[PDB]
Amino acid sequence: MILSDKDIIDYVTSKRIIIKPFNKDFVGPCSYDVTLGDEFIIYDDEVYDLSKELNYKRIKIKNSILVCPLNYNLTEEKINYFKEKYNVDYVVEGGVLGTTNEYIELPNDISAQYQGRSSLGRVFLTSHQTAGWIDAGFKGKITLEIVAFDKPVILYKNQRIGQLIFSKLLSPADV
Amino acid sequence: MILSDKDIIDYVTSKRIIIKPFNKDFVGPCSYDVTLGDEFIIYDDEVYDLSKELNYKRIKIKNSILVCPLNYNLTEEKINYFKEKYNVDYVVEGGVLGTTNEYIELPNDISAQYQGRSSLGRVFLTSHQTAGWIDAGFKGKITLEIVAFDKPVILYKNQRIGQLIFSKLLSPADV
Amino acid sequence: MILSDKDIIDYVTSKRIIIKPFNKDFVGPCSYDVTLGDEFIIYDDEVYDLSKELNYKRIKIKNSILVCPLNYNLTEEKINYFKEKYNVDYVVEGGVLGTTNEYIELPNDISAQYQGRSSLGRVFLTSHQTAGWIDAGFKGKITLEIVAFDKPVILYKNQRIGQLIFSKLLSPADV
Amino acid sequence: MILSDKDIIDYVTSKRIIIKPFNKDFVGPCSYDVTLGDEFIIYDDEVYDLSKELNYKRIKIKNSILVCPLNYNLTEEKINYFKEKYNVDYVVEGGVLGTTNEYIELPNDISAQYQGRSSLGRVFLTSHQTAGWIDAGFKGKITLEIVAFDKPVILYKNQRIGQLIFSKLLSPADVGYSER
Amino acid sequence: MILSDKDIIDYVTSKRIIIKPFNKDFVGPCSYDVTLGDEFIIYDDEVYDLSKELNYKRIKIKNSILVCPLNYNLTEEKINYFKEKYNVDYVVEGGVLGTTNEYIELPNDISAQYQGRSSLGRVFLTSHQTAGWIDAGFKGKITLEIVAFDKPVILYKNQRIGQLIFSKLLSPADVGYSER
Amino acid sequence: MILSDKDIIDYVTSKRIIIKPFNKDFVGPCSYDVTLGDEFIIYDDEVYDLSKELNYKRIKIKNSILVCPLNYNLTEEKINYFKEKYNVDYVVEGGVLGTTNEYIELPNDISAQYQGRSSLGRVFLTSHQTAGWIDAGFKGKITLEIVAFDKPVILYKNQRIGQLIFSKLLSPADVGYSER
Ligand SMILES: O=c1ccn([C@H]2C[C@H](O)[C@@H](COP(=O)(O)OP(=O)(O)OP(=O)(O)O)O2)c(=O)[nH]1
Ligand SMILES: O=c1ccn([C@H]2C[C@H](O)[C@@H](COP(=O)(O)OP(=O)(O)OP(=O)(O)O)O2)c(=O)[nH]1
Ligand SMILES: O=c1ccn([C@H]2C[C@H](O)[C@@H](COP(=O)(O)OP(=O)(O)OP(=O)(O)O)O2)c(=O)[nH]1
């Protein structure tokens, strides 16, 4: 059972579902729009070995970022070209980790799924690689996996980036 | 609660869920198979800036299309080579927008999720970049985001391309 | 209605949902962790034409495999370099098919969705290209579509690779 | 969850739930109205011992019946009085068995509950004395147990007597047997 | 599915379900307690014929009432005896209509069921003789049908008389009409 | 949604729902049958005032009991007649309290409803006069309120007396308290 706008509003009001910050204007028919944070993470190791601690660089943008498909072959000149042409603060190619501004807390009877925005999906920009289901009892902001699959895409700080679809559990969970 | 074949058939019959055109043979255990339209859209701008109107080219194929992974480096010769070898009408690399033939209308108590076909997923061809959830109250055809991630894939006009999974909402939505 | 840990445990116990092999420690708040098999499949044809029988190579690893993004341009030297540096048994670029060790059987009142692990999604490694919904009545192991979208990723035999989210159907299905 | 009018219509249309005869105008917001049959049964035993087949009489009214509360003491004189004053075909006191005209069939994923109508409950007339839940897989008409608890009540043949509330089961049920 | 205390609170808060007056402490694990109004109705007819508007009397108690089982035979002598011995404002026998103080409004996706409280059922006192399901979209107070089946029972004004069990509908229901 | 036989079995197996003693063959399509205990309670007061602890008598039958409708007027002569003619250990009239042999425990996500069995409702014998919904979190046996509305009915010790219908709650309920 997917929660409708009426249920989302009720759950947030009674604090069954925490969403900080919260804007009722982001409540859709059966989902809640979340926004893009200004902080990103770029890994700087040769390969991903989950058995080891990953090295990364923390990037914070002022207004926007240009996300290019992997192997876009970004040179010094190309980057400067893009910055001056599209007024982007940072230009990256390949994968980049972002985060929603919204911090959430889910009760033991609710599971949530994050999905990237439809308007961005139509331009081949995804903010999540997996289905996006989040365990009941979860607490924290939503980590985003941003990848462009066709051409560079401009993303803006605080812009709606996706939505959270809330689903009822058949029974309460033990976590 | 995901609708089973029995529920899909009931909802279509009473017009709670609209699906045009409709073929009962496309009704699966708990989903409905949709088909690929012959019309596609290819963007022709340098970058995607959602703050601006996007420029694109409308392509219509007769029978099939060959979708190549991005940066496949398609030259004049390669294209002609593929057309003559696989009898495809059009050859594209990177992202391409398509559409289901089926036009749908969802009631205020039903949310639907589109997912690309399993047989195509096994050959690394996706027709959707996001989770695919569609708001209750939605009306229209389903836009497809087609991308090949391993090797070129042939797609045929009117072939089953994915499925719609229908879910009940906990309460009716206000849209 | 998504099944919680309590429901998963009940359904497995009464054999409504089959999972072989089964480890109660893999039961999460509202999902079940599955593991990666040691057998993989690599297609060796020029293009994917679903109207024809696909040619492939069956690969079996001893401990681990390095999955590189497509067009990573793997040469003899690079491969040997990666094997000696990361102790991987096999190095592949682009798409590779894998499988969960777990064999499942779903009843007529349950639909399941497979999603790749969150820790792997954070390093841009996906084990499924589609939403991952599986029909009620389904029997068999879960086929995995593995693709790396940022940098090479090491995968280990028998490691948790994703999770199965179980959902109740509104009515029993006819298959 | 309880089936709304839209769900009842769908289930009848696809024959998931059988209702014979079916009247689309009997479908309410979240129930289906059923009507009173013209055949009633009156037991004829000193005490009721379920180990035995109870003795009874089968009567069939032409149009109406007057149900009096237990111990109303209906003498031939009183009976003729009521029949003439209210034009009722039959006069009874105490418990009387009736039936719905409607024959139903429930699937393995639906359970139904019968409830006597509120308008009759308002005059202390009941057509059931238990919750009235019906097992999924049930096939048949609904047996009614009619009792008046205050004053005699007039009931008419084919009148709406109660409603069926349909609820979904959490999972398909084993109806007790299977055929192949 | 039945709404738990958390669901009842949410629905009242957003006014999806109206309850007036509302007492947060009347919310139980999976129901809402309702209370007995001070106005009762007693019918005054030989028999009940629904084709007519039944004659009745409207009484209003100051604090309490003694409900005696039907055929208790209440003579002026007995009535004064009870009123003096138990200090009840009114003494009645048989069926009597009452009402809840609470006024409710149900949305198109909720159906409610009224049930008399267990503590009173334990002394064979009932405030309803049918299942008591209420249609989604209903607006109004709850009519009560009070009957004692063993010995006279004392009821007090404003006491908790029963509970409302709220259940979700499978789909939104057509409440019977619409306004634009 | 109502739990089907498969759900009842799962919940008992994992102890989410406690039922003692448990008989797997008492699991029906969408309910669980419960049985009649051998201990009954009969009140002994002129009127019932809930502000007080009512006086009662505790009887224990060896095998069976005859429940007669209220005002049946059971004299020593009549009582010995029934006991000898039907071999019943006890003869009572009016309301009598009984209990199920079964002890149950409900979790915070389940609500159960008790209903007297249809076969007994068919002879106008009821073991409950209210809807019978039980709060999630409830722990204990089921109290029964037995009343015959037509003729005396014979009940036997340990016989199936009714059923429990289990329904899922929309959300987990606060059972009223917590312990740490
Ligand atoms: O490939 C697609 C993309 C979108 N849609 C549908 C589903 C969704 O409900 C709607 C989204 O339309 P739009 O991009 O105008 O809205 P939005 O991105 O949800 O706006 P916002 O994030 O401000 O709520 O169109 C599809 O069916 N297929
Ligand atoms: O990675 C995968 C792909 C498929 N499946 C399962 C789920 C699905 O229910 C079934 C699909 O099998 P197949 O490709 O033969 O069917 P189809 O694409 O649904 O045929 P159609 O579109 O004509 O209905 O196999 C998995 O578990 N994992
Ligand atoms: O992009 C992401 C990734 C994860 N999560 C949340 C959802 C999920 O429930 C949790 C997963 O955290 P972690 O990677 O530590 O756990 P795991 O991969 O589920 O461990 P395991 O597979 O051993 O159960 O964090 C998000 O919200 N967004």
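^ deoxyuridine-5'-triphosphate complex. The two ends of chain B are 20 Å apart (CA to CA). The pocket of deoxyuridine-5'-triphosphate (ligand 3) is lined by residues A 134-135, 138, 142-143, 145; C 28, 33, 117-119, 121-122, 160 (CB under 6 Å).
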